[model samples]
Target: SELLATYLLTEPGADTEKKAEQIATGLTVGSWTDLPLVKQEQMQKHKGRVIKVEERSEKQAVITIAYPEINFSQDIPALLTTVFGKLSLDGKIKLIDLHFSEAFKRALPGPKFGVYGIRKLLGEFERPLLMSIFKGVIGRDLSDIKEQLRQQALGGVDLIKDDEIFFETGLAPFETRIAEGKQILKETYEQTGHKTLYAVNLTGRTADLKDKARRAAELGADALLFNVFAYGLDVMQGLAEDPEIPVPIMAHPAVSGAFTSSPFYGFSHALLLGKLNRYCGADFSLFPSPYGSVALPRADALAIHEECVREDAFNQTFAVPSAGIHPGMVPLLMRDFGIDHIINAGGGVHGHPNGAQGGGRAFRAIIDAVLEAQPIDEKAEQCKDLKLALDKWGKA
Candidate 1:
C-alpha cells in the first residue's frame, strides 16, 4: 500500500466512525454524498484512508486519517492544501502530526547551517550558545543600535539580533544597521577576541524578501532574523535556500500563537515552531520557555526542543528557548535542551541595573558556572554582575 499523510483529528459532538470516514473522503476525493464520476479504482489509489479511531469522551474522539501521497506532489503548499485547506474551517479538528513519505522529506529544503554549522561559525564546541535581542530600536539611530551591538558583543554574546518588532525606519534603516552592525561586531571582535554574529531582521514585502536578504549578505550581515509566521514559511524557505545569502536564518515565533495556541482548534507548537520551521530551513528556531513570561508547558517546550535536535537525515536546527528568559534559568535550560541549543534573551540581557552590558556579562557568568558545574550562588558571590542579576531575577 502507498504511504499516507497522517492527521490527528478532534471534533466535538461528531460521530467518530462516520466522521473519520468523512474526513478521509472529504479531504481527498468525495464529499458527504458520493459522486457519479467516483470510481472504486480511483478511490483505491487516490482517496484518504481511515487508519484508526479512539473515543476520548462522549463528544470527543482522536482520529488518524491517512491521505495518499499522490494527492499532493510533495510540495509544501499543495500538501498543506490537501491536508488542511477546507478542513481547517470545519473547526475542532487540528492537524497535530504529519507522517511524510521519504520522497516528500527529500523535496523540502531543510536547514542549511544548522546546529553544527552554527557552532562551527562561533568556534564554540560544547556549550549552549548565548543570543541577545536588541530592545526598543524603533526610533533609535544607527549609533544607538551600534552601541547596543558593541555592548552585547563585548559582554560575550555569541549572537545579537534586531528585535522582531523592528522594521525599516528612518533612524535605523536596514542597510545602515547592517553596515554599522558588521563594523561594530568586527571592532568588538578585535578587542575581545569573541566572534559575535549580528542577526539583522529581514523585512519588507514577500516579493522583495529574498532580494533584501541577498543585499544584507552582500553588505556583510552575519545572520538573518525572520518573523517566519509574519511573512510565510515559503518566504523563509526562499531565503534559507538562496545561495547568494549564505547566512544562518533564525525563525522567530512571533505570530505562531494564533496557529499553535489553542489546544482544540490549532496545530501543536512542536509541529509549527519545531518540525515545520526546521523543515522550511530555519537554522535557529525560537520558542517560549517554561520559565519565560510567555511560557509553554514543560511538555510543549521539551517537544519543540526534541523536534529540533532529533536525529534525522535533515540537519538539526538549533532550538532557542526565548521570551522573558533570565541568566538564572540557564542551568534548567541547559538540562532541558542540553548544549545543542541557544539561550536567547532580550530583557534578561538588557534589564540589568548596570545596563545591557552588565546583563550580558551576567548571563555569560551563569553560562560559565553551569558549564563548569559550579554552584550559581558560589559563582554569584565572586561575580558582582551575576550577583546583581540573581538578586533581580533570582536563581531559578
Candidate 2:
C-alpha cells in the first residue's frame, strides 16, 4: 500500500519511536498531533507511518517508515525528495534500504540486458566473463585506438570498455571509435573464432544524449558504458528505456562515493550502487572490488553484489566488482562473487609485461583453472601468461 524506507539513526539518547514518528510526520504532514480531528481525518491517507523501530544501542536505532504513494509522484526524484530531501540534512542517519511496491517498482526501468542477456550476447556462458579497459586514450588518435582495441580483442576478452576519462576528441571522436572498433573486433572474431563486445563511453549533454546513443546503436555498437552517478540515474533510465539505443548500459561508480561511502550519513552501498543502479537500468554495475586499490569493504562489496543479482522484478544486473583487478585476484573474486560477475580491469590488463592480450589470456586461464578445480600453481605452469601474471601480481 506504500513505499517503505529504512534508516539507521546514530543520534545519542534519541527516542527511536519518537524519531520514527517525527519522520513519519515531518517528512509528510506537519503538526500532526496539534491538528483538529477533522483535519486529521482528511489527512489520514497523506501521512507516513512508523512501521518498525528497534534500538541497536544508546545512540543507534534502525527504523522503518512507510510513505503513502499518494503523497508523491512515482519518479525517483519525487520519491527521493519525499523521503530524504530535507531529512538528509537533519541528523546522523543513513538510508539503509527501500521497499517499493509492485506499481512503484513498475515506474523503474530495470536493466535492458542483464547477466543472462550479456552472457547470451557473447555466446559463452559457462564461466565468469572477462573484460578489460582502454587506458589513457585522452589525446590519442584513431590509429592508437585501433591498436588498443585490437590487442584487447585478440586476448579473447568478452567485453572491452572505454575509459570513463575518455571524452570526445577531433582525432578520435565517439562515432569514429565505435566504427573503427567494430572493424577491429570483427577481425578478431574471424581470426580467433571468439567474439568480444565493446562498451563505448556515452558522455556529453543531457538533452543530446538520446540521439547520440541512437547514433552509436546505428553504428553497430555492442554496449554503452555510462557514468551514471556523474550524470544522474534518471539520465541512465532514459537511455535504457529508449528502444533505438538498445545496448546494455554499464553503470560506473564514478562520483557515487559521495552518496554511498559514509556509514553515518548518506545511502548504503547496497541500496545505491546495487539496488538503485539495477533498478534504473544498469545492465552492469561497476564498483570498487574488495581486492582492489580503490576498494570497498569486503562486506559492502558483497552487499552490492547481492543487490545486483537478487530476485526482483527485473533482469539480473551483472555485478561487476572492479578497479585494480588482476589475474591473480580472479580466484578470490570468483570465490566471493561466483561466476555471475565480470572480471574488469584497466591497469591490470594494459600494464602487463606480456601486453593486454597476455593480460586477458591470463585472467581467462585463471578463471578456467578455478572452474575446472585445478590447482592454480599447475595451471600457471601450463599457461605462460598466467605464470607471468601470477609472478607480477601475487595470487590470493
Candidate 3:
C-alpha cells in the first residue's frame, strides 16, 4: 500500500461528502471538472483517496484526505506542497498528523544527538536537564554578557543560549560572544566543576545561515540555536547534517505560533514543532509551556512534548517547555513531561530577586528536590535562594 499523508479539514456551508471528493481530486489529479487529457489509468494510480469524511456538525466536518507517496519527494517543501498547497487557500485546513512510510522516514535526517546522546554529553543521567536563556543581550557588551554566562554556569545550568532577540551587533558580535562565552564557561567549569553548553544563535540571510553556523562551530560554540520556523525546516536540516557544524542544534519555536496557533487552519503544534523539528534534525525542540504566559492549552503542550520524546525509529529529541517557566512550576512541569525533558527558562531564570545566578541555583535546587522525592517546601527551608524564588513566584 502507498504511504499516505492525513489532513484535517473543515468546510462550512458545503456538503462534506462532495467537498471531500472535490478536495481529494483537486489536490491530486483534475479539478472539479475532468480534463480530456486526464486518463482513467492516471487517476487510479496517482489520485488522492478520500478515506474518511466525518461530519462534526451541520456545517463542520473533519475530512481525512490521503495522498499517495508518489506525489511527494523526500523534501519537506515538496511534501508540504503536495499535502496542503492549493487546498490551503480553499478552506479551513490543519495538518494534524502524518503517516510516513519507513522509506520516507529514512529519507529524513533525524536528530544526531537525541535524548540519550545529550544526556551522555551532559553527564547527567538520572534527572531532567536544566537550560537557561541569556537575557537582555541586545545592547550588552562582552564583559556584561560574560558575567551573566559565568553566573548561570556557576549555578549549574546544563545549557545556556543567546536570546533569540539577539543578533550580530556591535554591542555583541557573533564571534566575540561565542569566544567570550566559551571562556567564561571554561572558567565556571574550573570553579564549579559543572560544564554548561552555550548555544549561539545562527541568524542571517538564508544563503549565509549555514556558513554562520559553521563559523560558530569553528569558534568553539557548544551548540547552535535556530528559529526553525522563522527560517525554514530545511535550513535546520542543513545545519544538523553539516559535518563542520558538529554541535547539537536547538530549534527555537519563534514564529511557530503563526503555523500552529490556529485550531482550524495551519498545522497542529505537535505536527509543526514536535514531529517536524525532530524529523529535521533538531537535537532540542523548544515550545511554549501551558503554565507560562503563552496561551497554549495544556493538552496541546503535552502533545508536543510527547511527540519530541516518544520512542520511535527516529532518535528522540529533548522536549523543552519554555517561556515563563519558573522554579515554582518545576514539580508540575516534571509531573507532565517527566525526567527525560529539558526545563528551559528565560525570565524564569533571570527574574529571581537575587539575580541570574540565584535563579539558576533555585532551578537546580527544585530539580534536585524533585528527583530525590523530597518536598520542595522542605528543601526550600534549607535553600534560601529557592525559598526566595518560591516566595516570589509562589507554588502553584
Per lDDT, the best of the predicted structures is: 2
What is the Cα-based lDDT of residue 212 in candidate 2? Answer: 94
Query: What is the per-residue lDDT of model 3 for residues 1-396, given as tens digits with 9 covering 90 to 100?
Result: 355656666654467778778778787775524544556665677788888777764256676777778876777888888887876776787788776777888778889888988888878888888899777777889888898888888878899988887887997899888898999888898888787888888888889987888888789888788898888998788878788887788999998888888878888888888898998999999988888887578898888888898887788999998878889889889899998999887768788888888898999998899889898889999889899998888873
C-alpha-based local distance difference test score of model 1: 0.83
Task: Report model 3's TM-score to 2 decimal places.
Answer: 0.94
Clashing residue pairs, backbone N/CA/C < 3 A, model 1? none
- Model 1 lowest lDDT segment of ten: 1-10
Q: What is the lDDT, from 0 to 100, of the residue 317 in candidate 2?
A: 95
> Mind giving the per-residue lDDT tens digits that candidate 1 earns over 20-74?
8887888787752454455666566777888888787425677777888877766
* C-alpha lDDT of all candidate models, in order: 0.83, 0.89, 0.83
RMSD of each: 2.2, 1.4, 2.1
Considering every candidate listed, which one attains the maximal TM-score?
2
In candidate 1, stretches whose alpha carbon ends up further than 4 angstroms from where it belongs are 1-8, 11-15, 31-39, 57-59
Candidate 2 collision pairs: none
Question: Candidate 3: how large is its RMSD?
Answer: 2.1
lDDT of 2 by residue, 139-176 (tens): 88888888988898888788888889898889989998
